[PDB]
């Protein structure tokens, strides 16, 4: 069947004259060939060629006929071309062999095919292709495949440990298993303390600061316990989606010889992974470690729960807030010999979350209960929180960069108090006043806080505001520059940040924008583009590959896209943006720790230089109250330390 | 009371009465029964905590001899303290020598 | 379930079990018959019989564990009387 072409080369002229780098429904990407309309003739799926013909027509129209298209838009088109074609060439390079089989051909001969997975690509594409190309294109991959076929790190090689736990104590030596870099004392002491906690028998929490090495530390510890503690039986690492590649990359650099997998994708993908990747002689499971996201647990809850897991590891473990979370349920329907929860801040909000965490580590073992709870000052609660502190302290690891590595330069952090526009004042009043006519002019009062907060960031979050603003300007609609002005004037924060951005543009500074509100990050995306800025956006909507390569490019030092724009809920977690010196927040959340995490996205082992952080705060509006409540939550953190 | 002055639960008066009655010594200093009661009820608190954990793992509201035997044999220190001690309705720690199994 | 499985089942059952393994009336009969040899006409608290029963079972199972350890030391699975005699002598009995 027809599969959709890599590239095109030389309307009826377009149909007759040209040639296209086809692919076929049953043949891997390396089976791409240049083909022509009459040479192929009518074939199943030819509407894809029609689609590509339409695409090629509009490409010709945009690249060649439209006189308005600016040179930088042609450069962005050339970027899209070369970047996608290079990624097709990456699809033309294998990444993994899954198994080997010899099969008979129609000539009566036989050939040895390797089930080949491909780079940037998954087990939906992966298929049996003759080894004759694999062996020359990626003999490293052949070697790794022959390793992964034979590691004997598999469930059948390890027992039911719980009856016995030998001691461990701290050590001062670099982990010999590790290829990927060089632990310092703090990462090693991570390894040490986790090993000691395991040797008490226990489940533990890692909360040395965000970006401080946990991933490398946790892979080094899992390697240690596999090798040292013979933990050959499956380990499950649950990971936020965006970081799943980095975790893979950690293995692929730190212990590349391990036989470990990531589990994702459509039912077909997950089925082919289960049968080919997991199952031997369908069972016993070929892999030692499986990466998953939270939702892919629910996608196969009982199936993966049928494995006797030896280790659970949990990135951003505050993802487990409460016992009733479907995740928390599933993870306790699973059974495991060990649990380890990783987060650079151990609790977001409230004692009950930490209670649920410690119950997940060691259920019922800690007498933490509402009967003593966080009155803002109380001798009894302050006593009991210090008692809980000393009780837990053997079971938590925590440090700051201030402790860990003074080499890492600090953060400037500042609030930017800013005034309302007239538009802001009007709309905010029209929420304080209850004006159904104003709602009818651009429509719900059913959450006044949300309405006024989103207004307070931007009135254009009401769609009729852009019309009535640019019409009362009258010229605003008329030109790009008049639109740009009529937009940016409408919030004082937008004016201030535009000034600051122009300064950074002259500075050459690299900057991260964060917001809670996707529509605001869209308005800002449009502002950046009409301002001619080079930038990337990230939010929870962009799928894995494009978001990954966007992060990669922006971290590439030649990236002319000097601004990254991010959602908080997706973009604020897990990721390192070491190319950025500066961070700005349009609006704090109720939870401060999320803001600390966003800061951590800049603030990392990899940060070369002292970072600067700014919060855009509207004068005399509720976010000050939000900030005070978030600070109270931080006071709870300061109490537990 | 003396127990309340110490804040203990155990009956300091009773144990002092027994120390006289037992004829352990012609003289019994007033601190002796306080100290003894303290360490005694501390020991009972310890083993009760372990028996409670055993009842929790057996998922039973009532502590029963089986749970005591499980706790006390599982704590090496107590088992050492009690190596020649046994209980009605006890039982061996469930265990099989690996060589016996296939 | 493959023969010998019955042994494993019995083992796990009786280790799970706490209850008396031996017929009580034969036991009480035997003990009072022995006691008559020391002294005639003794009456018994039933609880005394129960205490003796518990002690007897506990002592026997201890001895059986000791003899199993001996038997495995001989690298054979069948316990033999000589194993009992050895274990008793090592215990100094």
């Amino acid at each position: 069947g027809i599969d959709i072409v890599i590239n095109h080369r030389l309307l009826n002229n377009c149909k007759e004259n040209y040639e296209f780098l086809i692919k076929w429904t049953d043949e891997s990407h390396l089976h791409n060939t240049w083909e022509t309309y009459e040479s192929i003739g009518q074939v199943r799926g030819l509407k894809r060629l029609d689609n590509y013909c339409k695409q090629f027509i509009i490409e010709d129209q945009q690249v060649r006929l439209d006189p308005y298209v600016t040179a930088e838009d042609i450069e962005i088109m050339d970027m899209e071309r070369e970047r996608r074609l290079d990624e097709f060439e990456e699809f033309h390079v294998p990444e993994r062999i899954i198994d080997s089989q010899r099969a008979s051909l129609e000539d009566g001969t036989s050939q040895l095919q390797y089930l080949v997975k491909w780079r940037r690509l998954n087990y939906d594409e992966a298929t049996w292709e003759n080894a004759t190309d694999i062996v020359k294109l990626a003999p490293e991959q052949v070697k790794h495949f022959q390793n992964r076929e034979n590691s004997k790190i598999l469930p059948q090689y390890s027992s039911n440990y719980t009856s016995q736990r030998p001691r461990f104590e701290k050590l001062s030596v670099q982990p010999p298993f590790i290829k990927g870099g060089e632990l310092r004392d703090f990462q090693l002491t991570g390894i040490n303390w986790m090993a000691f906690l395991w040797s008490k028998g226990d489940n533990g929490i890692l909360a040395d600061e965000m970006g401080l090495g946990k991933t490398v530390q946790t892979v080094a510890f899992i390697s240690w316990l596999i090798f040292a503690r013979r933990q050959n039986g499956p380990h499950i690492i649950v990971v936020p989606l965006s970081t799943m590649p980095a975790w893979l990359d950690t293995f692929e650099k730190w212990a590349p010889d391990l036989n470990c997998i990531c589990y994702m994708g459509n039912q077909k993908s997950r089925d082919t992974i289960r049968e080919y990747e997991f199952y031997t002689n369908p069972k016993t499971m070929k892999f030692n470690v499986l990466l998953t996201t939270y939702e892919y647990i629910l996608k196969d809850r009982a199936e993966l729960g049928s494995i006797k897991w030896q280790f659970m590891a949990v990135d951003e473990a505050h993802r487990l807030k409460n016992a009733e979370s479907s995740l928390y349920e599933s993870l306790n329907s699973f059974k495991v010999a060990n649990r380890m929860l990783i987060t650079g801040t151990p609790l977001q909000n409230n004692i009950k979350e930490l209670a649920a965490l410690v119950n997940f580590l060691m259920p019922g073992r800690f007498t933490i209960d509402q009967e003593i709870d966080f009155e803002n000052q109380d001798e009894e609660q302050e006593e009991y929180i210090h008692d809980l502190h000393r009780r837990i302290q053997p079971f938590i690891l925590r440090r700051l960069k201030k402790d860990v590595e003074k080499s890492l330069p600090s953060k400037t952090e500042r609030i930017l108090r800013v005034e309302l526009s007239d538009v802001q004042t009007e709309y905010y009043k029209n929420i304080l006043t209850k004006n159904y006519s104003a709602l009818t002019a651009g429509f719900s009062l059913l959450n006044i806080m949300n309405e006024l907060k989103k207004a307070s960031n931007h009135p254009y979050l009401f769609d009729n505001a852009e019309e009535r603003v640019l019409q009362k300007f009258g010229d605003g609609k008329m030109t790009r520059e008049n639109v740009l002005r009529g937009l940016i004037m409408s919030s004082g924060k937008m004016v201030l940040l535009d000034q600051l951005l122009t300064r950074l543009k002259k500075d050459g500074h690299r900057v991260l924008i964060f917001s809670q509100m996707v529509r605001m990050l869209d308005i800002l995306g449009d502002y950046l583009s009409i301002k001619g800025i080079n930038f990337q956006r990230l939010d929870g909507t962009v799928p894995s590959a494009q978001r990954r390569i966007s992060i990669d490019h922006f971290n590439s030092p030649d990236s002319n896209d000097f601004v990254f724009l991010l959602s908080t809920r997706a973009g604020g977690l897990g990721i390192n943006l070491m190319t950025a010196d500066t961070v700005v927040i349009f609006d704090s959340d109720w939870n401060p720790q999320a803001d600390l995490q966003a800061m951590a996205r800049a603030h990392r082992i990899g940060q070369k230089n002292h970072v600067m952080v700014y919060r855009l705060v509207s004068k005399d509006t509720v976010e000050e109250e939000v900030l005070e409540r978030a600070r109270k939550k931080m006071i709870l953190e300061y109490a537990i330390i | 009371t003396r127990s309340s002055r110490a804040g203990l639960q155990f009956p300091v008066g009773r144990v002092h009465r027994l120390l006289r009655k037992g004829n352990y010594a012609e003289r019994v200093g007033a601190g002796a029964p306080v100290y003894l009661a303290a360490v005694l009820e501390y020991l009972t608190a310890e083993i009760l905590e372990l028996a409670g954990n055993a009842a929790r793992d057996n998922k039973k509201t009532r502590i029963i001899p089986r749970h005591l035997q499980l706790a006390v044999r599982n704590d090496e220190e107590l088992n050492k303290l009690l190596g020649r001690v046994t209980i009605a309705q006890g039982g061996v720690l469930p265990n099989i020598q690996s060589v016996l199994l296939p | 379930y493959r023969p010998g499985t019955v042994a494993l089942r019995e083992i796990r059952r009786y280790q799970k079990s706490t209850e008396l393994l031996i017929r009580k009336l034969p036991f009480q009969r035997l003990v009072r018959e022995i006691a008559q040899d020391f002294k005639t006409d003794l009456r018994f608290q039933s609880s005394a019989v129960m205490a003796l029963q518990e002690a007897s079972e506990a002592y026997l199972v201890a001895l059986f564990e000791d003899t199993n350890l001996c038997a495995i030391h001989a690298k054979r699975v069948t316990i033999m009387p000589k194993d009992i005699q050895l274990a008793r002598r090592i215990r100094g009995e």
């Binding site: 736990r165 008490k200 028998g201 053997p394 | 310890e46 905590e49 055993a54 057996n58 | 493959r2 499985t5």
Partner: peptide, 23 residues
């Protein structure tokens, strides 16, 4: 209101079992 403060290992009790591969 009373708690141990000894260091201790983690330990669990399980009476029950299954004859998984005795068939």
């Amino acid at each position: 209101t009373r708690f141990s403060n000894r260091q201790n290992k983690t330990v669990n009790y399980n009476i029950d079992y299954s004859d998984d591969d005795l068939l």
